[PDB]
Structures are given as structure tokens and as C-alpha cells.
Amino acid sequence: NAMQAIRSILVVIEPDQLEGLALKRAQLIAGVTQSHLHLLVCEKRRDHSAALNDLAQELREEGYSVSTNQAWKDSLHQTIIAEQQAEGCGLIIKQHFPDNPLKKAILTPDDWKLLRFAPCPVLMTKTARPWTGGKILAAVDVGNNDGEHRSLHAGIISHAYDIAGLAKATLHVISAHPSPLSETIEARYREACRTFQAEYGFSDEQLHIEEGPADVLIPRTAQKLDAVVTVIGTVARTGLSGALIGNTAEVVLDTLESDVLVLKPDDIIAHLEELASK
Numbered sequence: 342n343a344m345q346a347i348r349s350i351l352v353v354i355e356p357d358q359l360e361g362l363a364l365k366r367a368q369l370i371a372g373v374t375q376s377h378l379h380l381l382v383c384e385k386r387r388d389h390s391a392a393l394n395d396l397a398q399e400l401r402e403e404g405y406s407v408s409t410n411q412a413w414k415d416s417l418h419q420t421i422i423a424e425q426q427a428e429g430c431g432l433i434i435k436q437h438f439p440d441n442p443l444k445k446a447i448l449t450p451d452d453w454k455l456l457r458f459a460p461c462p463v464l465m466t467k468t469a470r471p472w473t474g475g476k477i478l479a480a481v482d483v484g485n486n487d488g489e490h491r492s493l494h495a496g497i498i499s500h501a502y503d504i505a506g507l508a509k510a511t512l513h514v515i516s517a518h519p520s521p522l523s524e525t526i527e528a529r530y531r532e533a534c535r536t537f538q539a540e541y542g543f544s545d546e547q548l549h550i551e552e553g554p555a556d557v558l559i560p561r562t563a564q565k566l567d568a569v570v571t572v573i574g575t576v577a578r579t580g581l582s583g584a585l586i587g588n589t590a591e592v593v594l595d596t597l598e599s600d601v602l603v604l605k606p607d608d609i610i611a612h613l614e615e616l617a618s619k
């Protein structure tokens with residue numbers, strides 16, 4: 342019940358866009374989990390206090406626990422992470438607004454800095470489709486069961502399952518294992534796969550076991566299922582020079598048309614919490 346355990350959600354509110362999907366997803370989640378909503382506008386110039394008060398009043402009348410703030414220091418991603426630290430939020434929800442209408446799935450450079458440094462789960466909303474009744478896709482690699490991958494996969498499945506339940510949606514899993522006596526090593530992999538299926542109670546129809554590059558297999562499955570949310574984890578160990586997202590998550594985040602919930606390994610979250618608390 343990973344989502345039920347999140348007791349406050351940071352909702353990034355845009356002042357000038359015609360969609361408000363960050364708050365719509367926050368209302369759906371908190372309507373079930375009774376989580377607190379902290380609404381943040383990141384801007385220095387205009388005084389948004391009256392509009393934030395009116396929005397908070399309307400949500401409290403609907404039964405939500407709500408606080409609001411307007412802040413600005415240095416950059417958009419730094420303002421968001423500083424607010425997450427001040428309010429102790431366990432999830433950040435932000436809507437994706439692409440810089441180029443001909444490259445609509447590409448995240449902005451500031452979105453990438455938010456995903457790199459956030460010391461908590463980040464939900465990047467990329468579609469206006471409602472979650473209710475849709476398909477939720479979890480991305481794992483059943484071919485690896487070391488302590489670090491077991492923990493990360495358990496978190497990806499816990500969050501994806503809680504989302505499927507609160508949205509009255511169906512849950513699907515994509516396992517993309519790199520292409521490789523070949524029949525015997527395949528037995529160890531088939532063993533890992535059958536154990537994963539029993540441990541997590543997945544039907545054959547829910548579990549997509551595919552061989553090939555994860556960076557293209559994850560988006561293909563999301564597109565074929567018309568998934569509305571994809572849950573992914575960043576790489577178990579950082580690459581050189583602080584490259585902690587990893588190539589698979591970099592490509593998938595810039596390609597998916599679904600919303601994306603980005604989780605990080607516990608050891609990476611702990612180090613990012615230290616950096617954010619400086």
C-alpha cells in the first residue's frame with residue numbers, strides 16, 4: 342500500500358496553462374488515500390495569494406486537507422525540491438509542458454533536473470486522459486533478483502498496484518531482458534520469471550516477458566496497451582559523473598505518452614535527501 346502511506350503530496354500549480362492535470366491526479370489520489378495536498382506556485386512577480394486561497398477553500402469544502410504557498414528561489418526545480426523538503430511531502434506531481442510542439446514527448450531540461458535531484462517519487466503527468474478505468478503499466482527486469490533490484494521491483498509493483506486500485510484500473514507488467522547451453526541459461530531466467538509470477542500473483546495475460554532493448558520495449562508495451570500511467574525505476578547504481586537516471590529511464594521518459602511515476606532505489610533516495618537538506 343505504497344500510495345496510502347504517502348501522507349502529503351506536493352502539487353505544482355501552473356498559473357497560465359489551460360490544463361490542470363497535476364491537481365486532477367492529486368484529487369483522485371487524495372480522494373482515496375486522504376493524503377494532504379500542498380499546492381505550490383513557483384513565481385516571483387505576480388501575487389497569486391488570493392487565487393491560491395480561493396482554490397484551497399473550494400478543495401477544503403470537497404473534504405481535502407490543503408495548504409498553499411507561492412515561492413521562488415534560483416530555479417523552478419530548486420523551488421519545487423525546497424518546498425518538498427519544507428513540507429515533508431512523499432510525492433511531487435508536476436504536469437509536463439513540452440518546449441517544441443513537434444517534439445511533444447521530450448521533457449524540458451528543468452523537468453530533467455527535478456527528476457534527477459528529487460528525493461522522493463515524482464509523477465510527471467503527460468496525458469489528459471483520466472486514470473479511472475485505464476491500464477497501469479509497471480516496468481521491471483525479472484532477470485535480476487539481487488537485493489537492490491528486489492527492493493526496487495517491490496516498490497514499482499506496490500505503487501502500480503495501489504494506483505490500479507484507487508483508479509479502478511487494470512495492472513500490467515513489462516519485463517524487458519537483454520538478448521543473450523543458451524537453452525539452459527534460459528531455464529534460470531524462466532525459473533526467475535515463474536517465481537516472480539507466483540510471488541506477485543500475475544496472470545500470463547498481465548505479464549509481458551519480452552527479449553530486446555528495454556528502452557524500446559517499455560514504450561512499445563505502453564503504446565499497445567494505451568497505458569495511462571507507467572511506473573519505472575531509475576538505475577540501481579549511478580553511472581559516471583552523477584548519471585543516476587540511467588539510459589533506459591532517460592529514453593523512456595522522453596518517449597512515453599502515458600503519465601510516468603519515477604521511483605529511485607532506497608540508497609539513491611537517502612543520498613539525495615542529504616543533498617536536498619544542505
Ligand SMILES: [Cl-]
Nearest residue numbers: 407408409410
Ligand atoms: Cl495554507
Ligand SMILES: [Cl-]
Nearest residue numbers: 365369471472
Ligand atoms: Cl484522473
Ligand SMILES: [Cl-]
Nearest residue numbers: 583584585586
Ligand atoms: Cl542523470
